Design a protein around this ligand. Structure first.
Ligand SMILES: OC[C@H]1O[C@H](O[C@H]2[C@H](O)[C@@H](O)[C@H](OCCCCCCC3CCCCC3)O[C@@H]2CO)[C@H](O)[C@@H](O)[C@@H]1O
Ligand SMILES: *C(=O)/C=C/N[C@@H](C(=O)O)[C@](C)(COC(=O)CCCC(=O)O)S(=O)O
Length: 259
C-alpha cells in the first residue's frame, strides 16, 4: 500500500467522490491524519453512537434506566427493523434498543430512543452541551443540504469525549465501547480481513449518492489505540467498491502505523 494520505487521494480519484478522514489517538486526541476534516458529510447511521451517548447521559443523571422496558406497536415500526420487529409482544429494554440501534442499525430502535432524548433538536442540544457546535441531527443526500451532517474532526472529537472524558460515568463509557465492539453489520467482516492482533470496534453508515462511512476504534496489540473516522459522499460507485476503497485506506493505516 501507499502512505495513508496518498491512498485517500487515490480513493477520491477512483470513486469520483469526496473522502473525509481523521485518524486520532484515542487517549490524547492527537490528530495524525486529517483530510477534508472540516468539510460536511452525511452522518447516516453513524449518528446512532451519539444517540446512545445521550441515552447513557440520562441514565447517569438518573432520568433513564437501561433496564426500562419500552412497549411499541407495529404501527410504530419504520423501514429496517431486524430486531425490533421480533418484539411486538414483549417490548425491548432501553439498553436492548441501543444494542439493536448500534449493532444492527435497527431504525425503529433508533427512532424510539430519539424520542426519549427530545428528538433531533434534543440530540443536537446534547451535542452543543458537550462542545460539538458542528454536528447536527434534523430528521427522524443532496449537495447544499446540511441536515444530518457532521465533519470528520467533529465526529472524532465527540466520540473521544463520549468514550474517555468524564462526561459519562465509567460504566456508561464501558457500555458505549462494548456496543461498538459488538457491531454485527461490519465488525465480523472486518475481523476476517484484519491481520492478527488488530482491535476493531465500529459503527457503519450508508446513504444516497454514494454516501458511506465508518466511525471506528483500531489498533495493534489488541488495543483501541486510535479513532478512525472515514466518510465518503457524492460518488456513483457500487457499494462493493465503496467498501473496497475504505478498506484500502485501512490497509494503508495498518502498513504505516508508526507516525
Ligand atoms: O504488514 C502488515 C500486514 O499486511 C498484510 O495485511 C493486510 C491484510 O491482509 C488485508 O486484509 C488488509 O485489508 C484492509 C482491511 C481493513 C478493513 C477495515 C478497516 C477499517 C477500520 C478502521 C476504520 C477505517 C477502515 O490490509 C492489511 C495491510 O495491507 C498481511 O496480510 C499481514 O500479514 C501483515 O501483518
Ligand atoms: C444507516 O446508515 C442506514 C443505512 N441505510 C438504511 C436506511 O436508510 O435506513 C437502509 C435500510 C439499509 O440499511 C442496511 O443495510 C443496514 C446497515 C446500515 C449501516 O451500515 O448502518 S437503506 O436501504 O439504505
Amino acid at each position: 500500500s501507499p502512505q495513508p494520505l496518498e491512498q485517500i487521494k487515490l480513493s477520491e480519484s477512483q470513486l469520483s467522490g469526496r473522502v473525509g478522514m481523521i485518524e486520532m489517538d484515542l487517549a490524547s486526541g492527537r490528530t495524525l491524519t486529517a483530510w477534508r476534516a472540516d468539510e460536511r458529510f452525511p452522518m447516516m447511521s453513524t449518528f446512532k453512537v451519539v444517540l446512545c451517548g445521550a441515552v447513557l447521559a440520562r441514565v447517569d443523571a438518573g432520568d433513564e434506566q437501561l433496564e426500562r422496558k419500552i412497549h411499541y406497536r407495529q404501527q410504530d415500526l419504520v423501514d429496517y427493523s431486524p430486531v425490533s420487529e421480533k418484539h411486538l409482544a414483549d417490548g425491548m429494554t432501553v439498553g436492548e434498543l441501543c444494542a439493536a440501534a448500534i449493532t444492527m442499525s435497527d431504525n425503529s430502535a433508533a427512532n424510539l430512543l430519539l424520542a426519549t432524548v427530545g428528538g433531533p433538536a434534543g440530540l443536537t442540544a446534547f451535542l452543543r452541551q458537550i462542545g460539538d457546535n458542528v454536528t447536527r441531527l434534523d430528521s427522524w443526500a443532496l449537495p447544499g443540504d446540511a441536515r444530518d451532517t457532521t465533519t470528520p474532526a467533529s465526529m472524532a472529537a465527540t466520540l473521544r469525549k463520549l468514550l474517555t472524558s468524564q462526561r459519562l460515568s465509567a460504566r456508561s463509557q464501558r457500555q458505549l465501547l462494548q456496543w461498538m465492539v459488538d457491531d454485527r453489520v461490519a465488525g465480523p467482516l472486518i475481523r476476517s480481513v484484519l491481520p492478527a492482533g488488530w482491535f476493531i470496534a465500529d459503527k457503519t453508515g450508508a446513504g444516497e449518492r454514494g454516501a458511506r462511512g465508518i466511525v471506528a476504534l483500531l489498533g495493534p496489540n489488541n488495543k483501541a489505540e486510535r479513532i478512525v473516522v472515514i466518510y465518503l459522499r457524492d460518488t456513483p460507485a457500487s457499494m462493493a467498491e465503496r467498501n473496497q476503497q475504505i478498506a484500502g485506506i485501512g490497509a494503508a493505516l495498518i502498513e504505516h502505523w508508526q507516525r
